[PDB]
Amino acid sequence: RFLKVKNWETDVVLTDTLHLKSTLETGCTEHICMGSIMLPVRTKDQLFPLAKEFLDQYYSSIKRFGSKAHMDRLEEVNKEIESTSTYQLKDTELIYGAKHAWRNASRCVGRIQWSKLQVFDARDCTTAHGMFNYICNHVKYATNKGNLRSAITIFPQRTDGKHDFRVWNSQLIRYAGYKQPDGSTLGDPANVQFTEICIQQGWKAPRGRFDVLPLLLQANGNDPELFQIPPELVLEVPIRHPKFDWFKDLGLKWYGLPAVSNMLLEIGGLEFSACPFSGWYMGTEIGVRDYCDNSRYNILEEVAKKMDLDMRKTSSLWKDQALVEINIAVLYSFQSDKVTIVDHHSATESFIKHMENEYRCRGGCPADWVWIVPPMSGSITPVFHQEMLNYRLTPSFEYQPDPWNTHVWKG
Amino acid sequence: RFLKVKNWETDVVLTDTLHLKSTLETGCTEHICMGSIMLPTKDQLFPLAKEFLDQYYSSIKRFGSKAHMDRLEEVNKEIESTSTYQLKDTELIYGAKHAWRNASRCVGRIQWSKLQVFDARDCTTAHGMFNYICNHVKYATNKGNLRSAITIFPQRTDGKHDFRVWNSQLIRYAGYKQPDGSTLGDPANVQFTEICIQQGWKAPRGRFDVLPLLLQANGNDPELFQIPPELVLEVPIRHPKFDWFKDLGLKWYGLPAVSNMLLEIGGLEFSACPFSGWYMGTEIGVRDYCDNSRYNILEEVAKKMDLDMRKTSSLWKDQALVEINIAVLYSFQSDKVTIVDHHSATESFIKHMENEYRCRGGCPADWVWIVPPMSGSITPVFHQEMLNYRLTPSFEYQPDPWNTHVW
């Protein structure tokens, strides 16, 4: 079957056939659309089909489908599964699998870059100290003194689900949040519970507004351990505005490396529960979401105060005005310090080009409109006007429960 | 079967049960989400009538009463005999209000129970339709103090005698392609403008010419009518800070009035049912003015502001966007023409959602449409999970008449 999507700005119509290779479920039915829902131990029986499907994709991609090498690899994996109940990926397969999980990530606007991903194979890791060393190396490599390079580090796969590797941090680099007795929050309100966990584990908290959190690392199902990333490895950007000289005195900064560390990478039915990955920022992630969400740094009022905007009625659009100025500041600051960043106009235009190329060469590009459209200035970006089809392909990145909710404490 | 929605800003979780009363289909499957797609007999009619009358009698707390059983019988007899049926005034009013209540793409539904319903089921000609519509327009406008209204023309019969308003909205501006290759006025309306001309219209050929109504009664050929200009309330656009803003020569109309949809009530189809409310500022300032395929005014405005248009990262589009939208709101407010900003309308919609969850067990909502086209995440609806499903009575899209009609 064929499905069409239209761009309502250009009248360009694309035809999706790739959705036919979709296995996982969306959450939607013919009677309900769950498109705006945020969050909607394997046996041998379920594993060989998943392995076979993956290896068929891999071998097609290298133009060796049905070759002796393809057939021998199927037989070898087959035997490994029946005898050991799992299997190991070849290095080439791991790399392919990680690149494809990114390519298939329908909530990611940055996918034009998918084929340029440095993969660090950390499957020989055994301890939390080992994980710390791997993660420092990834941070240093990815940071590259401001010239950011995409990377992912992949720790050993799940076995019985009792021996999981996990990074407890939601991102490798984030700021602490501290709930005060008066109910106000110092730092990032998103990180309060995690900060509290770190403190209980023995972290000495400086208790400021931008304290970089320690890494909390779990190897082989053991209790997690704390490590401080060397500060010289944490690139940060002080935020200033090109025209407003008082902007610097708001005391804002942000880190340059966006690096998600709490997702699960599935490749050929194997589950990599610790697979931190990083790219570079789109400005709005910081300027809109991190700074201006009511439940995050919430700076809108203080900025608009300083700008002397009319704040007595929402219809003056003071919030919208202060919002644009903050986002100008973020982009100006990163550019001035030569730290890679992309604005939402550039990123969305590139995404449309990527999506069109994917339809031509791949037969489709699963995309989640709710996530792809930037959180300011939606309709003056081309993605707002682009119909998208959302479906799930593997290899993939998936959510998983927070480890403090499930971990069996050893003591 | 029972579904949760969470607001990620406030942690408020609501439980939806209303979706189980859902009739029509979404376009989505377990394999594919089509959430961002814009447009995805006697035997058939009785279940539809019964479903509707049950909910009606339930609403007036008379479910299972003799009057309920008697009406279901009377409608059954009428369908068996005539192949259709007629709604009581009370049913028509209830049905229209509920089609609005059920409109998953509408942010303004807190207002759904204050809808003036004009019953135009006795209309027979296009001049009649014109009269009804002028009366609707004048009532709704109310000298700037806008009141929500719908006018309901006769229902479909055999489908060869359709009433239709060919216009997409009652009030829109003409669009003309130039020898130049550019577009004068609204590029969205070029095809409709040519159809008007093809049928005789005296196109003044300007940037903001109120289109004529093109009205089809009883399946006949449509006829042209100019709405009396004193009935079309328009607003000149100026900025509270920028004295140069007026020189762009921008104006818009005060009355948003969709006229091309189909109202379905109890299986009956009302193919001409123009309805109107009042604007949310972004519809004009973001969409009408700034879409590239619309008036597309960002470049001109940015130039007048003397912003750096060399690089996208100066956010010159975003700066101008905000100013254009401040101007729209300021102008309407200054001329006392009802308008709502996107902060206010979305805050109201959240309150409405909570009311609907509490009093009805849910509220179908299409996040893609509900979140405003600017400043998305600084409005509360951005952080609100929404379930989208189709309830009846409903408003539905229908084919443009010029493709269907035979002359």
Ligand code: HEM
């Ligand atoms: C190279 C520069 C990149 C840019 C500008 C970018 C952009 C983004 C943005 C803006 C989001 C939404 C984030 C949010 O709102 O929470 C996102 C999501 C995501 N991206 Fe990227 N991305 C990049 C690289 C990467 C890389 C290297 C990977 C993995 C190898 C990746 C995989 C993902 C995934 C799985 C999501 C969904 C996250 C979630 O559900 O929370 N992206 N991307």
Ligand code: HEM
């Ligand atoms: C009273 C003030 C109202 C406000 C502020 C409002 C707000 C809106 C907005 C912003 C849209 C999106 C339109 C677009 O982006 O193209 C919309 C759509 C819609 N509204 Fe309302 N609305 C109001 C009254 C009404 C009334 C009176 C009705 C019917 C009785 C109605 C039914 C609908 C329907 C069916 C849609 C979807 C239209 C489509 O799919 O193109 N609304 N509403």
Ligand SMILES: Cc1cc(N)nc(C[C@H]2CNC[C@H]2OCCNCc2ccco2)c1
């Ligand atoms: C690799 C990468 C690159 C990039 N530009 N942005 C990201 C996303 C990071 C940087 N900004 C927000 C954060 O995402 C956090 C995870 N997504 C939100 C979420 C929270 C719960 C479920 O989904 C990741």
Ligand SMILES: Cc1cc(N)nc(C[C@H]2CNC[C@H]2OCCNCc2ccco2)c1
């Ligand atoms: C009753 C009403 C009130 C209001 N504030 N806004 C509207 C919507 C009007 C005023 N601005 C856009 C237009 O709707 C056009 C129809 N929707 C867009 C569309 C185009 C094709 C399919 O769907 C209607």
Ligand SMILES: C[C@H](O)[C@H](O)[C@H]1CNc2nc(N)[nH]c(=O)c2N1
């Ligand atoms: C409820 C809603 O799905 C939720 O707030 C989503 C909307 N779109 C988003 N889009 C991006 N890129 N990131 C997000 O966190 C969200 N949040």
Ligand SMILES: C[C@H](O)[C@H](O)[C@H]1CNc2nc(N)[nH]c(=O)c2N1
């Ligand atoms: C393709 C996409 O669905 C399309 O651009 C939609 C997005 N959201 C919208 N939202 C509203 N309110 N009105 C619209 O016309 C649209 N257009």
Ligand SMILES: [Zn+2]
């Ligand atoms: Zn869906």
